[PDB]
Amino acid sequence: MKIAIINMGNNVINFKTVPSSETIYLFKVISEMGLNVDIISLKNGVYTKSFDEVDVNDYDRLIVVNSSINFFGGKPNLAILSAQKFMAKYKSKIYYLFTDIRLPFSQSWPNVKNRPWAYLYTEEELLIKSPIKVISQGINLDIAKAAHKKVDNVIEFEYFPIEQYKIHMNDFQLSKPTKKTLDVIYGGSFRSGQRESKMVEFLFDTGLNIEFFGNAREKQFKNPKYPWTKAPVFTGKIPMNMVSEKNSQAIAALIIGDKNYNDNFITLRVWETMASDAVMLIDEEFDTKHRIINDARFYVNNRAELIDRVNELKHSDVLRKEMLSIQHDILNKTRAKKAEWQDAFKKAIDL
Amino acid sequence: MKIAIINMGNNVINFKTVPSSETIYLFKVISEMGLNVDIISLKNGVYTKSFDEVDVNDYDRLIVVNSSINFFGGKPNLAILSAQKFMAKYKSKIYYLFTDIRLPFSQSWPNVKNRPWAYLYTEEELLIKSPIKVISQGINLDIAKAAHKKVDNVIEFEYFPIEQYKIHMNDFQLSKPTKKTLDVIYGGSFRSGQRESKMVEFLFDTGLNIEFFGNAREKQFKNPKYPWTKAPVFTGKIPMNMVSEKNSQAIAALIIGDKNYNDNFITLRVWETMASDAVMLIDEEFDTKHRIINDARFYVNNRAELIDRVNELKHSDVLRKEMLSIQHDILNKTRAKKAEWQDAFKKAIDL
DNA sequence: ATACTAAGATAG
DNA sequence: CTATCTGAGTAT
């Protein structure tokens, strides 16, 4: 039972990029399940074998982490092409991990055949004919089907909480009480549209000491529709395995709403936050039914509520520790189900 | 008082390179102050002592010419590493000359520890703990504090017109009346974005016989946001300390704006142009408050103001001299106050 | 060959 | 939008 996992459109080397670190963490958690698995990527590395140095048919299961197939600057992206070349040569069923609604499986050939560099590839080289099963992170399989109604070789759809790999990792550790230095903290990147509105709403002009870490830059918030005076402090990105300790430096860590996740996907951030020493405050829009934590106090709808809830927390150490113990209790109930989780995954890749 | 001066990331031997010349010229101007100074670098030379043969703690003052940490080809950069090991062993305050907004002081250790060759160094030998005093060439100390935010041991800030070392040199001599063969001249290299914009706004489609020397070619200008028909004449590189001799060839030398220096840093260029037989014209953005010269005639806004002024100088050999006589009187008044500059420097390195 | 380059591409 | 990531090309 030899399993191969690859990222469809991103180089896999270290933990310095989101797609790469996720592919490696998926490889690590699948290994810890007692499965023999390799990561194939563009070159040999600490975690990967080269596409050029293996026959895709030496594996009984091919898992493909979703990625986009857009070619930046119209130039050839070897990460995409080499991965699909590899997929096309596979004579068996392909398991596509759908963790981002914006990244449904997609053939590259069509987007390649009309390129100046088209001569480099042939349709037989890139066209994937194998049947594909989509393992959707989003519980709503209707949305998963919709996004793939463009590709006919997708024949199975199944829901599997992939993002739970962060809490099921053997070395998982709850954050320990921490000396606070921030009222509210939020990690992410800038995104125009409703995403800008949402962020200015919860992070700007709160009157609280807030830190926005990640890839966002203050000067990206210019839209006159969502004005502001006092912005939060911006910080550089942080290692995947440091997120929870980074969040723990604040009394409260926020989860903002997003049209591509709301009531459908539980995200890595939810767990990273719920695991920290920071009380997890969730944008009502993100989880209307409160599937995450069955306690209204963990939810906020606007700036007034966020400000009010955070101030109740910065004064009441007792209220803070209680909420903290409730979110840790909920996390652990989920963790207790590890074995069911692992079997569900084996079951999802027909093992 | 024994003073040691080093360049953080460049080797110092002679005047064959930009950074080396700067360090040696800084060295000479300080020696001419009657101070005891030594240049410490990689190998012993006419102007330098080797890092591996001197004990940094023998000096009462350690001056570090700003530089960047860029490990070309991912390989160890000996000037940066030797320099920072030297600085790390130092036990008193460090004086960092910030002559370029792009070169804030930076620790190299965080960079080295994650390199495959990290085992060749220890944090004890690279981590610089001594307090740092940034002596900024820019007069806006807020722009200087802003740049050194990442660092924590940078305690002081102070402005000092460092670029003036060229005029106060016991060597300095104004350029004598030169036979004109160019209407306009400008030295430098192109970068991108607005850098190219400006260079095209002031040196292209003017109808004037303009020359452009340094690291720059014609095709390097593609951006269809700033279109041009007739480009100036590119003369490539010239010696490394004959800029004044070069500029004097034209009727007027140009100083164009730059997001980094504008209303902050007076550059070596300014003084090398102000010292030439060429009338120095300045981009209004580079110095709006008109600090350089107090006379509107030397400043321009766009291609219009430019070509116009150059014409007034061509059709009035009398006007040329008058303005030329003005800039020289300014330089002369600055040079006469050499002692005020020197004493200001001493007070900068706490003497 | 020798020595210098004040760093360009990428992340989200 | 720049902090972070990657890792030899250019000038003598």
PDB file of C-alpha atoms in Angstrom, chain A residues 173-281:
ATOM      1  CA  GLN A 173       0.102  20.747  22.111  1.00  0.00           C
ATOM      2  CA  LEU A 174      -2.392  23.142  23.685  1.00  0.00           C
ATOM      3  CA  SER A 175      -1.021  26.628  24.229  1.00  0.00           C
ATOM      4  CA  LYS A 176      -0.130  27.349  27.854  1.00  0.00           C
ATOM      5  CA  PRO A 177      -1.241  30.422  29.815  1.00  0.00           C
ATOM      6  CA  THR A 178       0.642  33.417  28.414  1.00  0.00           C
ATOM      7  CA  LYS A 179       1.577  36.973  29.408  1.00  0.00           C
ATOM      8  CA  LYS A 180      -0.803  39.150  27.417  1.00  0.00           C
ATOM      9  CA  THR A 181       0.333  42.163  25.397  1.00  0.00           C
ATOM     10  CA  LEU A 182      -2.506  42.578  22.893  1.00  0.00           C
ATOM     11  CA  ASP A 183      -6.247  42.953  23.302  1.00  0.00           C
ATOM     12  CA  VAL A 184      -7.141  41.428  19.945  1.00  0.00           C
ATOM     13  CA  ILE A 185      -5.042  39.713  17.304  1.00  0.00           C
ATOM     14  CA  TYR A 186      -5.746  38.635  13.765  1.00  0.00           C
ATOM     15  CA  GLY A 187      -3.585  36.827  11.252  1.00  0.00           C
ATOM     16  CA  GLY A 188      -4.192  36.981   7.530  1.00  0.00           C
ATOM     17  CA  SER A 189      -3.693  38.827   4.279  1.00  0.00           C
ATOM     18  CA  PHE A 190      -5.399  41.716   2.516  1.00  0.00           C
ATOM     19  CA  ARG A 191      -8.384  40.996   0.296  1.00  0.00           C
ATOM     20  CA  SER A 192     -10.453  43.659  -1.466  1.00  0.00           C
ATOM     21  CA  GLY A 193     -14.240  43.766  -1.405  1.00  0.00           C
ATOM     22  CA  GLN A 194     -16.325  42.455   1.487  1.00  0.00           C
ATOM     23  CA  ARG A 195     -13.081  41.194   2.986  1.00  0.00           C
ATOM     24  CA  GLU A 196     -11.791  44.757   3.300  1.00  0.00           C
ATOM     25  CA  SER A 197     -15.073  45.913   4.818  1.00  0.00           C
ATOM     26  CA  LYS A 198     -15.039  43.086   7.359  1.00  0.00           C
ATOM     27  CA  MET A 199     -11.482  43.812   8.429  1.00  0.00           C
ATOM     28  CA  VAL A 200     -11.909  47.552   8.814  1.00  0.00           C
ATOM     29  CA  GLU A 201     -15.028  46.719  10.840  1.00  0.00           C
ATOM     30  CA  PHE A 202     -13.342  44.494  13.428  1.00  0.00           C
ATOM     31  CA  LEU A 203      -9.727  45.632  13.358  1.00  0.00           C
ATOM     32  CA  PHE A 204      -9.807  49.392  12.749  1.00  0.00           C
ATOM     33  CA  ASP A 205     -10.865  52.207  15.070  1.00  0.00           C
ATOM     34  CA  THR A 206     -11.709  49.767  17.851  1.00  0.00           C
ATOM     35  CA  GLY A 207      -9.939  51.785  20.509  1.00  0.00           C
ATOM     36  CA  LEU A 208      -8.257  48.508  21.469  1.00  0.00           C
ATOM     37  CA  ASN A 209      -4.649  47.468  21.022  1.00  0.00           C
ATOM     38  CA  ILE A 210      -4.852  45.200  17.966  1.00  0.00           C
ATOM     39  CA  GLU A 211      -2.173  43.466  15.918  1.00  0.00           C
ATOM     40  CA  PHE A 212      -2.747  42.328  12.321  1.00  0.00           C
ATOM     41  CA  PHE A 213       0.004  39.835  11.474  1.00  0.00           C
ATOM     42  CA  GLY A 214       0.688  38.107   8.191  1.00  0.00           C
ATOM     43  CA  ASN A 215       0.958  39.597   4.679  1.00  0.00           C
ATOM     44  CA  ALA A 216      -1.328  42.608   4.971  1.00  0.00           C
ATOM     45  CA  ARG A 217       0.061  46.106   4.662  1.00  0.00           C
ATOM     46  CA  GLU A 218      -1.736  49.128   6.088  1.00  0.00           C
ATOM     47  CA  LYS A 219      -1.610  50.942   2.749  1.00  0.00           C
ATOM     48  CA  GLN A 220      -3.756  48.295   1.011  1.00  0.00           C
ATOM     49  CA  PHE A 221      -6.874  49.621   2.767  1.00  0.00           C
ATOM     50  CA  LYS A 222      -7.752  52.614   0.564  1.00  0.00           C
ATOM     51  CA  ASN A 223     -11.334  51.982  -0.567  1.00  0.00           C
ATOM     52  CA  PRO A 224     -13.386  55.119   0.250  1.00  0.00           C
ATOM     53  CA  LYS A 225     -16.424  52.926   0.989  1.00  0.00           C
ATOM     54  CA  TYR A 226     -14.745  51.539   4.128  1.00  0.00           C
ATOM     55  CA  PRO A 227     -12.903  54.542   5.654  1.00  0.00           C
ATOM     56  CA  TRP A 228     -10.808  54.567   8.814  1.00  0.00           C
ATOM     57  CA  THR A 229      -8.640  56.763  10.991  1.00  0.00           C
ATOM     58  CA  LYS A 230      -6.887  54.472  13.492  1.00  0.00           C
ATOM     59  CA  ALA A 231      -5.438  51.292  11.981  1.00  0.00           C
ATOM     60  CA  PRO A 232      -4.167  48.249  13.896  1.00  0.00           C
ATOM     61  CA  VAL A 233      -0.420  47.461  13.998  1.00  0.00           C
ATOM     62  CA  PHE A 234       0.761  45.296  11.085  1.00  0.00           C
ATOM     63  CA  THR A 235       3.314  42.503  11.481  1.00  0.00           C
ATOM     64  CA  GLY A 236       5.290  40.172   9.217  1.00  0.00           C
ATOM     65  CA  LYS A 237       4.208  36.611   8.652  1.00  0.00           C
ATOM     66  CA  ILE A 238       4.759  33.771  11.097  1.00  0.00           C
ATOM     67  CA  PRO A 239       5.696  30.052  10.805  1.00  0.00           C
ATOM     68  CA  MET A 240       2.845  27.530  10.600  1.00  0.00           C
ATOM     69  CA  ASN A 241       3.882  25.902  13.865  1.00  0.00           C
ATOM     70  CA  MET A 242       3.979  29.259  15.658  1.00  0.00           C
ATOM     71  CA  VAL A 243       0.481  30.568  14.910  1.00  0.00           C
ATOM     72  CA  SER A 244      -1.052  29.330  18.148  1.00  0.00           C
ATOM     73  CA  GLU A 245       1.739  30.794  20.275  1.00  0.00           C
ATOM     74  CA  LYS A 246       1.424  34.044  18.303  1.00  0.00           C
ATOM     75  CA  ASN A 247      -2.368  34.126  18.909  1.00  0.00           C
ATOM     76  CA  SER A 248      -1.805  33.278  22.582  1.00  0.00           C
ATOM     77  CA  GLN A 249      -0.189  36.684  23.058  1.00  0.00           C
ATOM     78  CA  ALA A 250      -3.624  38.284  22.900  1.00  0.00           C
ATOM     79  CA  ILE A 251      -6.659  38.242  25.146  1.00  0.00           C
ATOM     80  CA  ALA A 252      -8.789  37.516  22.081  1.00  0.00           C
ATOM     81  CA  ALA A 253      -8.127  36.233  18.556  1.00  0.00           C
ATOM     82  CA  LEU A 254     -10.705  36.868  15.863  1.00  0.00           C
ATOM     83  CA  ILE A 255     -12.157  34.669  13.094  1.00  0.00           C
ATOM     84  CA  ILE A 256     -13.654  36.893  10.349  1.00  0.00           C
ATOM     85  CA  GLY A 257     -16.473  35.909   7.992  1.00  0.00           C
ATOM     86  CA  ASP A 258     -15.945  34.954   4.350  1.00  0.00           C
ATOM     87  CA  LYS A 259     -18.342  34.121   1.488  1.00  0.00           C
ATOM     88  CA  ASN A 260     -16.111  31.191   0.530  1.00  0.00           C
ATOM     89  CA  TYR A 261     -16.243  29.508   3.964  1.00  0.00           C
ATOM     90  CA  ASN A 262     -19.350  30.664   5.873  1.00  0.00           C
ATOM     91  CA  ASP A 263     -21.378  27.749   7.228  1.00  0.00           C
ATOM     92  CA  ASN A 264     -19.474  25.377   4.955  1.00  0.00           C
ATOM     93  CA  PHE A 265     -15.736  25.114   5.674  1.00  0.00           C
ATOM     94  CA  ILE A 266     -14.133  24.887   9.083  1.00  0.00           C
ATOM     95  CA  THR A 267     -10.671  26.364   8.493  1.00  0.00           C
ATOM     96  CA  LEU A 268      -7.157  25.844   9.791  1.00  0.00           C
ATOM     97  CA  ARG A 269      -7.398  29.207  11.553  1.00  0.00           C
ATOM     98  CA  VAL A 270     -10.339  28.064  13.649  1.00  0.00           C
ATOM     99  CA  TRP A 271      -8.242  25.285  15.168  1.00  0.00           C
ATOM    100  CA  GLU A 272      -5.075  27.395  15.392  1.00  0.00           C
ATOM    101  CA  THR A 273      -7.070  29.961  17.314  1.00  0.00           C
ATOM    102  CA  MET A 274      -9.141  27.595  19.461  1.00  0.00           C
ATOM    103  CA  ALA A 275      -5.898  25.947  20.504  1.00  0.00           C
ATOM    104  CA  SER A 276      -4.167  29.141  21.629  1.00  0.00           C
ATOM    105  CA  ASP A 277      -4.379  30.953  24.975  1.00  0.00           C
ATOM    106  CA  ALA A 278      -6.450  33.593  23.177  1.00  0.00           C
ATOM    107  CA  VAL A 279     -10.207  33.483  23.537  1.00  0.00           C
ATOM    108  CA  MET A 280     -11.659  32.685  20.136  1.00  0.00           C
ATOM    109  CA  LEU A 281     -14.150  35.361  19.008  1.00  0.00           C
TER     110      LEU A 281
END
